[PDB]
């Protein structure tokens, strides 16, 4: 048994940025009191972990990255509750601890013991569970999905059912989820309603799922990269429009197409311009845009503020505005029972060892999801 | 009689920015149809009223002035069925003219007919009722109450309860609407929330009183006047905060006072700065910050989308979010069933001679409202 044993084993270590991720070995200690030890099984490539590598998304370095992902407990410490050794389990990036007053808000599901606002990049105890070549690597949001076994707090992991299929309910862990709940939850599109998706990838694939779902009449994709139209009109995307297009700003086109602004916009891109795009797209009165894109450290937009005046509500999200151990099993439960579709959004398969090959795919645009098995 | 005739009469002109009103002798023309003259009663001194003195808001001069009013209708265009001559009214400085996808939408108030957003200074029709010296005269917001006469468009005037003490419910045309809409309704604040709200003035204490009327426990008054905190206690706050008094910025006081943010913020001064602040004082994860002030015309702040992203709903209104002419009546008839007070905001009652002194008198920080009398 490797219980109370230090495992050793591959990870894709991330020593500086702008550099290939290292697949090399590191040793994984067992898990303390409520922390959870995990083998992994799948892994998603989210455009925030290649955030991490460009430097968008500023955490310490050394890190193991990946935080969307789904596995099997091979351990647990002292005092854990909530997960078994052989239970199937997806991490959560937003942990759920259940008793701060974030938790116990009917709609707050940024908990406070979040690693996302000011990174550690460490367990809640303040120290990591990794070594490298003999040198202590950081943690990533909590999860590090990115190496063949975690270990993670237990505010940080949900069990989900036994016969989940991995390799698709990983997405569930990320861009799914926060697609989709940004629509339904965060903006509470309505029906017949016109909506407007800013980034079609796999966050605003799911986005637009999410706003089908909800009832939309009208769902306006918006990229510069017209390859990313086909799937957004399949998963129900009514209209794509590419801002290089037009000689007029693309606030102007789709205010203008939508007969004097949208009731629903949403960022998912991750630039301060198509935030504020995104904000003046909405009708001035009743419109409602939501920020899910991960805009550059420390930088500032700027905007007019009686774009707000007359009645706009901006707003942002992490992860759907989901309660994310409520939340997750239950859209496990709902995946199994065919109520949304995962498939669409996974364009490409890898071994784990070729991660880098799946970053590389991202980055020329060709990949919604590349699902890695490790 | 006067119906059908041009009416000359006192009105204040404000001919250039930075200089007192003139009161003068001006020529009213008629109303044409589907519109109203109205012999003012009480008017209220409303900071935007000085916004348009200080150049802080742009719109065509010469001027009549004047937002927050009450009257008696004295004739009415052909076509005219919501009001008649004898008819206590209130004008609307947003207009309702219940055909626009606004007026249609359950939660929109700022009406595609309203002269806010690129003001013409004119009548529906493109032309203006005043003359003074020979000269044309622009209107404003549809309103220009600071007239014995005014000319309104029908869909800017609300009926309103014969009984009505018209010296006391102007304050419902513009600063007690708009703050406590902004509470009940903007808002929505709950039962055993914390409240904070900049800026004390007349619509900052209406912000007060609905925040009390919706059950807030906290509501925590901030101005760098004093001397406005007595009266913000009375109407309901339960502290006031000075950030001059302070050495650290007053979000990260008001964070430690709440116990890591507000519930519910309000900016109801009109600076970048404060519109920033506040959003920043609510909880990151499930506050709301709503703009109530006019910011100074072309400027753009400068914010960190972070803010948002944590899950921070940011909006702003007009008129509290009240679709104005249905509900001014509403506001009136809950007032004569003692549902709320006015008193409070009302700190001096001068003739309308004395405009010149009321403004001056808002400017030195002594007043709430001003009301002028015909
Ligand atoms: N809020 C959250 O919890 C959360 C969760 C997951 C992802 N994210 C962020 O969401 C964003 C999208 O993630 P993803 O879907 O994995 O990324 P992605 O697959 O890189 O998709 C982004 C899309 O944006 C398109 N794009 C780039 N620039 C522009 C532009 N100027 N105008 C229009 N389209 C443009 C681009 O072509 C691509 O299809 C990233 O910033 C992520 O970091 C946030
Ligand atoms: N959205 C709307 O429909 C609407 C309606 C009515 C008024 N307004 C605006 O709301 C604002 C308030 O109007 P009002 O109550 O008549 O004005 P007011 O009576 O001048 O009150 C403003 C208050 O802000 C205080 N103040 C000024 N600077 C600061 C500062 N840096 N920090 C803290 N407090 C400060 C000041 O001492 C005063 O008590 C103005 O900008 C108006 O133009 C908007
Ligand atoms: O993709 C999800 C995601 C985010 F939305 C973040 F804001 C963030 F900081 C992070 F690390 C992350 F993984
Ligand atoms: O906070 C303790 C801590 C460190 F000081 C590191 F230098 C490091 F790489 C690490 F991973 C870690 F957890
Ligand atoms: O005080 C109410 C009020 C506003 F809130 C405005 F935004 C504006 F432009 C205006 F003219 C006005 F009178
Ligand atoms: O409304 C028409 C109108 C004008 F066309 C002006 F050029 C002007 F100065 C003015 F005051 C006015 F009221
Ligand atoms: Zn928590
Ligand atoms: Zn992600
Ligand atoms: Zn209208
Ligand atoms: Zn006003």
Known sequence: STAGKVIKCKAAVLWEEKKPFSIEEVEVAPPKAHEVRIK??????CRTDDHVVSGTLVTPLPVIAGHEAAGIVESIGEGVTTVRPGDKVIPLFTPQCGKCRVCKHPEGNFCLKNDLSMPRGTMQDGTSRFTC??????????????????????????????????????????????????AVKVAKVTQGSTCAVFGL?????????????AGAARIIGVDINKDKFAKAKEVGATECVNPQDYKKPIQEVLTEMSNGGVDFSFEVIGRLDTMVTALSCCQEAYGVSVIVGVPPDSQN????PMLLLSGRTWKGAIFGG???????????????????????LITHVLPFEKINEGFDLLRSGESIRTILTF
Chains 1, 2 share one sequence.
Do not use: W
Request: proline share 4%.
């Open 40 to 45: 992994m099984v799948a892994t998603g490539i």
């Open 201 to 213: 990838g796999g966050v605003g694939l799911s986005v637009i799922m999410g706003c089908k779902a």
């Open 322 to 344: 989901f309660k994310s151990k409520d939340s997750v099993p239950k859209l496990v439960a709902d995946f199994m029972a065919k109520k949304f579709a995962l498939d669409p």
């Open 133 to 182: 070549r003999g040198k202590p690597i950081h943690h990533f949001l909590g999860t590090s999905t990115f190496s063949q076994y975690t270990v993670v707090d237990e505010i940080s992991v949900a069990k989900i059912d036994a016969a989940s299929p991995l390799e698709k309910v990983c997405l569930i862990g990320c861009g799914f989820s926060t697609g989709y709940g940004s």
């Open 301 to 304: 937009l700027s905007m007019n």
